[PDB]
Symmetry: D2
Subunit: 508 residues, 4 copies
């Protein structure tokens, strides 16, 4: 294959950075090296933050918060509108960085940037809503209401695979809610975040807003840990592996803070006897192989009825063999590279484990064109037929592997969907009205997202996004997910000039 050169990738990144307003001389250094999975090569070195720098960032965000929180929410919304426009103006530059750092294909990178723009627009809406309630009180001559107030500094820790959209869900919402933001991006994807931050900084200057509303702290897990421990950060939104949940969640809880946890997924689709197989095959392929199986919403388990299981595996086999793998800057490419060597190693280990546990590799799994970029890990998605939901099937391997399991009764398909520790998304493919409803019912699929005739990535801005069980319970983006960024007050107002006298005794 023909893969973009490291020199040209580097020059495209520097151009995209300077066009988004980044000062390259100010951000360059030698504490952390930016990289690209397209070739595996280093791009250039960057300054990183000390743990002392995190605390200085928190103090700056908190100082800004004290002004932002009495700035009227619709004025705060004017800022987010302005940022949305700058994102629109620089959509292709930002997308190039997403492709360069995350390795996702160009169309998906553009879609991730559009997601940021769409949440800005939604947040501008929210800025005139953030609804509490007015309600009756049992007390004569009193009034009762419930109000919502800005919480404070929000710590946002994000992953490599959606390096701009996850932050955008949190920042757009947090900013209209009157919060400020300290962002600790993945050590794998710092360039996207610097570009994001400079665009928002321009928005801040144009809008006359306070300077410290958003702050980026570049570094590894230790910088995240200091952010997590801060007594001035009442909400940490953390996205990453299920592993992280056991560290972050209890730590924040121990200091009486709040978390939004968006952890791993292990998403299944059920394919029933009446499923439209052309539709099912297209949906399953795109959800399993898309982003080189590196979405939290990636399709990893296909629970197929035994009467159609052979036809389904045959058709998925043929499709997997035809998937075009390549440079994610080429429009013909559908599957770009895995993020690094370790990711390839873990994929290979899961597949070896699955065969040891009684599985059969049906298609895929081989590394593609290793000599064309020996530092990069381009792999064909693996399709693995399994005789039961064994150990490896229940673990999230962050790579494109689709395990196929069979069932007969719908309640067993539901059981198999729910048996895993993760709880993000689930889908059912069926022409049958009652089966679709049974899958979505209280005793149906147990996930945060449960869909009919669309796959495990079927989600959108207006929906609250997140999962149950070991996916951590958090919600972002749509519906009333904004409530996690604000504090509720219940207010009783007496206008009668009287209080109930205990026992009829009076101290006037």
């Amino acid at each position: 294959a023909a893969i973009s050169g490291t020199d040209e990738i580097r020059a495209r990144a520097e151009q995209a950075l300077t066009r988004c307003g980044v000062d390259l001389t100010a951000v360059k250094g030698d504490a952390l090296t930016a990289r690209t999975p397209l070739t595996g090569a280093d791009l250039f070195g960057l300054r990183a933050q000390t743990p002392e720098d995190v605390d200085r960032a928190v103090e700056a965000a908190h100082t800004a918060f004290l002004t932002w929180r009495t700035t009227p929410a619709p004025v705060r919304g004017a800022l987010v509108k302005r940022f949305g426009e700058l994102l629109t103006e620089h959509k292709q530059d930002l997308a190039d960085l997403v492709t360069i750092e995350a390795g996702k294909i160009r169309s998906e990178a553009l879609g991730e940037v559009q997601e940021m723009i769409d949440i800005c627009d939604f947040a501008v809406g929210l800025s005139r809503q953030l609804y509490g309630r007015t309600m009756p009180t049992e007390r004569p001559g009193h009034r009762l209401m419930e109000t919502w107030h800005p919480l404070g500094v929000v710590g946002v820790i994000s992953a490599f695979n959606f390096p701009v959209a996850v932050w955008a869900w949190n920042a757009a919402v947090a900013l209209v809610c009157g919060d400020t933001v300290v962002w600790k991006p993945s050590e794998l994807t710092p360039l996207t975040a610097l570009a994001c931050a400079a665009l928002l900084d321009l928005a801040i200057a144009d809008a006359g807003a306070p300077k410290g509303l958003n702050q980026v702290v570049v570094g590894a897990a230790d910088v995240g840990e200091r952010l997590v421990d801060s007594p001035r950060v009442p909400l940490v939104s953390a996205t990453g592996s299920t592993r992280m949940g056991r560290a972050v969640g209890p730590r924040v809880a121990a200091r009486f803070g709040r978390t939004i946890l968006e952890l791993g997924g292990n998403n299944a689709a059920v394919v029933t006897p009446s499923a439209d197989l052309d539709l099912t095959v297209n949906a399953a392929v795109f959800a399993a192989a898309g982003t080189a199986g590196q979405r939290c919403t990636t399709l990893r388990r296909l629970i197929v009825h035994e009467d159609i299981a052979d036809t389904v595996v045959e058709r998925l086999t043929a499709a997997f063999e035809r998937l075009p793998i390549g440079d994610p800057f080429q429009d013909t490419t559908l599957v770009g590279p895995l993020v690094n060597e370790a990711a390839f190693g873990r994929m290979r280990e899961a597949v070896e484990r699955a065969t040891a546990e009684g599985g059969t590799l049906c298609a895929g799994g081989e590394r593609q064109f290793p000599d064309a970029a020996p530092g990069a890990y381009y792999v064909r998605p693996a399709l693995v037929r399994m005789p039961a939901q064994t150990a490896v099937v229940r673990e999230e391997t962050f790579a494109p592997i689709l395990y196929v399991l069979t069932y007969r009764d719908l309640d067993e398909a539901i059981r198999l969907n729910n048996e895993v520790p993760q709880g993000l998304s689930a889908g059912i493919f069926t022409a049958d009205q009652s089966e679709a409803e049974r899958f979505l019912a209280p005793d149906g699929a147990d996930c945060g997202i449960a869909n009919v005739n669309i796959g495990t990535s079927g989600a959108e801005i207006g929906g609250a996004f997140g999962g149950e069980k070991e996916t951590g319970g958090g919600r972002e983006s749509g519906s009333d997910a904004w409530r996690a960024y604000m504090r509720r007050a219940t207010n009783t107002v007496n206008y009668s000039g009287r209080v109930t006298l205990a026992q009829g005794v009076d101290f006037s």
Copy 2:
């Protein structure tokens, strides 16, 4: 001076109340745990306890029950709650005897707590036809999008001594209409209240034909509480108690990817501005500080009074405190019953001494009343302590009637004084000034979960979400959409178009 009922007379009243609520005394009596009363400080009789193994058996029973209950239509689940509230109404007096006996509350407050149970039952029956999710537009042609709410599982309820029936009721009425089941670990100090509650609910269940395992009481100390907290079968723990306990429960449950409602300590203040109606303020402040002998979580503990009226406000409260009738909580004349135990009396005296060491002046109260009338019991006159600053003891919750009086000049200083403590439950402002009232409730005002105007820190009701911020723990109970913490959200996209976005235009069919 006052006459206090005898341990024998209290015991017999307790046994009557239990029997009438359907408790089998033979079956619950034993030697593991002792029932007691703060009226005399004496033990009443021994009870059987549950081991940590029994807790696990009770959780699994509750889970089996949940597997049926979650597909029981919520309005049918509501019918169960309506019937329960019918039995509470019928046994209101009996259940209120047990509340007074175990918590030391005066009769009118004991009746008020039982009515609160009845009111949340009524509210929950309403919720049982609501539990609203949402329908909304989708960007996808030929698709539909919605949000649905589902039953969660077994709910672990850990309650305190001071509201021995209402706190569980808030949780259980709501949990049950939401399709959940309940395992309740009541205070080791107040088991009989819980046994009577559970026996009445068991009757309701039998009348409704509902599953047997919907609610269960596990009796014992904090070690029984810990086994409930650790169960991987309990996705929600509602824990009510001291701030200290939060650092145990919240992280433990978080570590196993569970959810908590934490309802922890308060250290609640009221601001008295120069335009305050002093008669309203003094009466409000008295009830809020002295009621339940300062053992509500919403008890008024700090009074932040403008310097121009501080001297007159202190005189009036000094005189009001000196006139509080302290006595047996079964007598109609009693406004202040006893403290729960000796430990609570010790901490009260320790705080008053510290406050006077830290520059404070004791203005009224703080002395033990008629010790020889009931030597095992601790009846005290509420303390009023004028303080020159907000020092360490002022910032601690001592669970006792102590009102600290602090002065201020600018409203923003009053607000900072309110917000400076680690707790964040409740706050009030007494003022006739429109602007001050709104400033106190504003985003840069009082930082508490409840913020009121011209009514004290115990001013809340069923329809409001009840709870606090900061070291109070963030949880909400009872009103508004507090029910959501008892269910799980699902976001559902339904494709009826027969087609899917083709990635890069490629069709694999």
Copy 3:
């Protein structure tokens, strides 16, 4: 053949039921209006009526009551409704006798209608702590913005013969918790049901210590209804009745700047697709078409069946209709009681003849049963008429059991056939196909206020907003936030900043 109870035996049962519900028979008897029963078609006894003057006096009493009720805390207003529902529970059987006696409904449906009253009372008690407005941000610094809901005034309730207690209950339980008062004009065909309802509510009111004028019944014909509609003291008229009546009431009330809830005729259809479960479909279709002898507003009147299964569906319904037990509605065996009166029988026969003149084939039923068993009463077998097109008679609501069967090929043709009529209350689709189900409920699907999947046109409940579109009149009753039509919205901006935007920067101080 069947045995029908005698007018004397019905009268005596009615008098018992009234007395037991607290009606004073001496005081309501008179010679202006006659109580009657469809069981025999006979008059029972005479009643006093109200003149148009009496209506005006009753409205003014209701308004005086409203002036107190609107400042009564909604949760206290809820306590009244809870007590009312306690009396309905206690007198369920008695009130259900009167429903069967006046509306001709079978016992189980009469009991179901009274339970519906009880259920809306329970739902309303919940609402009484909700009635939610909103708090929201304002663009103005140092300001606050909110939305509040307030009591409206006197609510005029005009009801029909076929649901003589539930319709009023939906309106009144909700109106009363919302701070409103009620003036009720029941059908001239069903006054006794209303008198018994009102007498029980008057007892509740006395027990609660609530104002006397909260609810009043005005007995008489459509001229008493018109005076209520015209009153400038009645800001809301809820009118239930024929489509014809809407063109009277809606414009009259609009002309005086008042509000209406209009709940008018239906002409409801179900679509039967080739994948339909025929056993489910046939049973559903039978109950929906034949129940209440086709005198529910949600009665199934049109069946739109796919041509591939039309012959088999018609055979099965032909046989089911021929087996419907028609009889005295007090007997447990009866599924179909009588039509309300002779006029209704005349219109039924007139429609069947027109349908057969318009190309239709009568497949089953339509004949008067046992005329000589009760010569004044009109018991009929439901009619099943196969039609070649949707002609004029098919598009009219005839208030009688007639099911027209129309065939289709494409789902979009079924949908157009559903939507082609002037009414828009209720619709159903019977199908096992996921896509067809969703297409029927989509924006370009069934255009009705109620659209169901695998359940008939009478599939609705308390928690849902009940009502229709088009000539059904747009009003909603009972569930969701239907309560909003009984209150007025206020939008409140509160400035606590002490300053105002200066126009052109000019300061006039």
Copy 4:
């Protein structure tokens, strides 16, 4: 004074029209003449619509509706976002037309255009919301929900005094709700609406939307009447005099259609003994005199406590005498002209009536600089002290007249506020906490808008806008006012395969 010439006003209008995309040769004619209250002169003639043209407009809007209603709401929102941007781009051109036709000062014209932009932004938010409910059903194996669907063609009839914002409240909301719009603007302000329509038409082309989404029908009340009678228009939003309500409301009701009625106002403010008098005087002056007293929210009644009544009247007298009256294109101008001669005649007649009913003219009422533009009616706001709330005080005269009434007890101030037939807005000025709450309580002011320490124009996008009593009960713009543009469906879904068997009898 120095007033803009008719020639230069004409040329500014033609320029603003052509810059907004209007074809001047296509819209010109001689059926209706566009005009300006700045000089009173005719600008130029226009084509007008026949009643047959209205029915052709309805048919075109309905044809568009059949496509728009299955276009996903967020896609519909993309159009409104785009229109918001075009409005932003042409904000000054549109504002010049508003000043030219409505006669309002330049800053207010700019503010009315910004209102359009702000509702577009809010509607873009709504396009991912339009919330119904999901809820429990009492039936085993069933599911229950409430959904909202597009209604159809919306008839929008608007007044002269807000010639762009009223339409924008209705169109932005109606378009995201999946409705289409037929707009019948005031015969006094057709140029603004043509400009509006051409900007939205450009948005439609850029967005790929259907052509007939919005249609303008130019003419007088007879064209409105035909629109009102149409069986294909299920919702008429009508703004105008209380007079219109008695015609439109019953007509639409007679054909089972829906209305939103936004009729006259007669708004009062209560000034209590603790009122901040500097604040009260500024607020009252701006609300009484602003827009030459030609807002529906205009302050017309001031209910002042007797202890401060003399000081308040003295201070208002001095302020009214100082008000600068002038060309609304001059930034020094605060009060521009009245709309026409008839408006001046009615003002003069009310003032003569008020003095006959026992009143005293304290300040204002005189026509200003008549020779400078003898076709134009520039008047100083009138301040009239009244001994009781007489007949004229209770009628809305659409001109700047402020009646002053005295009270002693707050309940009488509330009574006087509520005694009038109109019910739009009300305000109370007070430093007293209980008085403010009493004014807003269930037995307080009876209006649609009730405010504290801000006047009768205190309202904003996020609030639902409208009134009670003879103001007609309608709501527009904020909160959930969108519900009037859609139809509710209650949906019960059976997935159990069972129905309840009546009496245990079965027909299987």
